[PDB]
Amino acid sequence: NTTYKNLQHHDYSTYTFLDLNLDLSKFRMPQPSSGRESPR
Amino acid sequence: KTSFGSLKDEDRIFTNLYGRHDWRLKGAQSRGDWYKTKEILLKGPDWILGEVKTSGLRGRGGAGFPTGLKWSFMNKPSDGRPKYLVVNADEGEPGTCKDREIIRHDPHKLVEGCLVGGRAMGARAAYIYIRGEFYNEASNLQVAIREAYEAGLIGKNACGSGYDFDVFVVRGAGAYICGEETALIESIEGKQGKPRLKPPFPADVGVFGCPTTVANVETVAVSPTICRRGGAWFASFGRERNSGTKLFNISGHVNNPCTVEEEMSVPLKELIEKHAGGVTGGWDNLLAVIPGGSSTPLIPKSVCETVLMDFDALIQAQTGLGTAAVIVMDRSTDIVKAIARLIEFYKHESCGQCTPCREGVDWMNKVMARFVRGDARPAEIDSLWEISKQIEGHTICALGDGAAWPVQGLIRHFRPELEERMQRFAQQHQ
């Protein structure tokens, strides 16, 4: 058994990271803040 | 208490060294992940923490600290500020190749261990900082987190819990100092990668003020096996205090330049000749051996014939066992030129907070270039010893220390070699 089970990664273009980020952004906790919009 | 042990198969931490059986959530299910994990997560964090401190885990990535003590420091009762877990997926240290392979093959076990760590210390979210040059395997980790989210397996109520937990990936941008303890933390914060000071601990104030912690990929990856498997079975290998498994990675002038999983202790000559090829040109052909890493001094032949692979033995050999670069170099090459290129690496990768590492790596790079040319007098090489003593312990992080140590090893072992080189250039000029 010497068959490379990957090379499913071979197809990766440039924007695939951020596209996966945009597709995988929901069902998520609401990022709890504290008070001010900024440190200024 | 055996003859320092040797690894036997199927007791390994992970399978799929290269290209093997599976890459899927179902592949992790077949290889034994997300198995019995519900009541493991739902037993009580003191049991998991006592298990971690029982197993005697030696921390990796270039620190060598017992991880169970650090996570016991992470057991502060919680205030209004949330707790975070940081996964250091960076590879500097030329010779490493180490958790690149883990994060290519089995990111599911990384998800296992980071959920285990988040449940363990009352943490809430796990950031995973990968090196920015690791884009392909970072996207493979993205596909893995997609699978993990798509199974309904983490997020809200992981495996039927009353527990919420999210994992994120932050890509790097490329610097060795990004993979440090706290310049990491501020590189998450949007500042340029520049560390903080030790008297504020990361367990008090971290990412914007979150009482957080940082761990290596290997320690997180081996952590759920500690939970789902027995006490001190992990400690049944190697020596007493340092005990467990490690990727010993032998690049350089060897046959089959590659990686092995082995136990905590191995004799070096058996490691070279048995489980990864051997020395090119015979055992006597080698000039020297660098174990530990690029933050570790050299070791000559007559020392390393009997020096085995253990933290305490290498510390008694005045070397810090870092990670994964455990390679040799042939008599044919200039170790002067090799160390000079290593110091050029340190010059081209350091931020400039501290004055002494900046100026010390400056002098060391210029003076080692001079010694490549062989220009000076031996009072200069003792002056190189002088600055190499003066740098250490005067910095923020250990990059200046890891710059200071190879010069010390070169002086402590290869003194008449440099004497003869400079004599040759004296005859060359005159």
Place this chain on the structure above:
Amino acid sequence: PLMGWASTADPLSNLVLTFSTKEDAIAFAEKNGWSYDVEERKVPKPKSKSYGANFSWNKRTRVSTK
């Protein structure tokens, strides 16, 4: 007018008398007859600083640059 120097008809111009207490200072100024003015010593005020104060969570004290 001949060179462009600084001339003065002031014999007590360029003295300074270093003392170690204000009490004997005022005592000496009374003792040798001349009038005197007494300014007052202003200490550096002690403060409260920490690197942890520079790295707060919600508080606006944040160096944002280091």
Place this chain on the structure above:
Amino acid sequence: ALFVHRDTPKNNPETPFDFTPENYKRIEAIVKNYPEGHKAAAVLPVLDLAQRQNGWLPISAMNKVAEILQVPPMRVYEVATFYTMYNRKPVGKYHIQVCTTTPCMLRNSDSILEAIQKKLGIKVGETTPDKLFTLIEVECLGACVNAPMVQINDNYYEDLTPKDIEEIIDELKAGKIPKPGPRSGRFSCEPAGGLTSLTEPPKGPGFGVQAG
């Protein structure tokens, strides 16, 4: 390395720069990942997004990011001049990174640069008198077990040789994508021998656990 701007139009704002609003949706995803109140953290992902939407970034890209995230611009200039991603100096299409520090030089990395010299023509560190063949050498990119490693845009190449140097250069002159897997056999990060490691497939959930 010329860390002063030296205006020189084709730079010198306003250079024309803008994102697609689909990329603005990406930007809201990126600052949806981070906690509120500390919006200034996403400088590195947003700025890599800008370097990928436009291959080398000008100063107008940095001013655009500063107008988006309402931070002072000097932080953006610090982050851009700091790291090694962001080629502020203009480049061509591709970008060639010959990576070598200690073991790659120990395994004849300089002959690789000799091959790039006598085939590609131009010197190391410099560029070609057209696009798509900007050439530099770099420090450690991890994969030390293989030959001196060649990284092009989001792609590794491992275990090379001068005739395979010629092959990958011919593949770049043909323009088509090569495979990011290593050349000269041993298809992964491998022992080149005969798998001294595991033989039998693991049982998985069947072998030794302890009171789950």
Place this chain on the structure above:
Amino acid sequence: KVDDAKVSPPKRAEMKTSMESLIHHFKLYTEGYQVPPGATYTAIEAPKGEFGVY
């Protein structure tokens, strides 16, 4: 001279090469060397007699 570049000034070649030598030349000729406090007396043979400096 003495090999003490905080009291005796350095020689001019190593002054115009080195940095520390220039700083020591500069402040040694502006401010002069500091002296620990106290009083001393010494006397040697002048040809007239006990030449004492206090």
Place this chain on the structure above:
Amino acid sequence: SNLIEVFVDGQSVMVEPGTTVLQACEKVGMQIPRFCYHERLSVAGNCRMCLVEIEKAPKVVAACAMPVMKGWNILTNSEKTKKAREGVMEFLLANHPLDCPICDQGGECDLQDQSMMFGSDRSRFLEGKRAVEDKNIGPLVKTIMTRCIQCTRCIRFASEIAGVDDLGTTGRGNDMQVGTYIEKMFMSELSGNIIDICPVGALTSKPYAFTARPWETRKTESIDVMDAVG
């Protein structure tokens, strides 16, 4: 209650909690040779001149950010303290040019005073000494950034009390130009205060630039005008 004991060179004193070593040393009359600390700014542990040896410690800690734990014994004048100060001063005088005549802080440098009273005298570093291209920060402030020792004091100055954020660090290693990348005039109010913040002769006055020298001039008490504050 609110009092913590230190043996500063074996001399016991009570210290308020939360404060650090340098405030205790100024409480007992000591100084510590320091560069990047300043008593109006934030604390950023960068200068490394401020080191001091505590007993039972393998390292030597910085005396700016270390909080005062209970019952110290601080050796301000130990052996390796002086050794570390000689080392760090010898590092600081490698990349600093020979401008002691033409500089504007002859008697009023800080490198010169600390290099006498704590530094070495015989030097090393035969070859090197990087050079940095200067900027034009504004027609009120003369700027030669080669004398800059990258002590990171004007940056915190601006980012706190000016809030302008035009001065940043650019680069790594030996090559860290501190300034504005875009050649914009750093001009606001209190910009004249930056030429005294600069502890070396790098950011200096433009109309005063080559007109005097501090030891000739005499100081005189006075009160401000043109403002209701004085």
Place this chain on the structure above:
Amino acid sequence: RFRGEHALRRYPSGEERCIACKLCEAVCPAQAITIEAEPRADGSRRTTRYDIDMTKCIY
């Protein structure tokens, strides 16, 4: 090594060797040196006035 005229010098094919950094007035034990310094429009630092009291000069 005789000590006479108190002359000045200039560079080989160049202007005055003086910089006006006032070290000689700082060390002159009779305080005979008088220096007032202004830079020219070229940017280099120079003088206005440079006086030696050959009366006060103890050589």
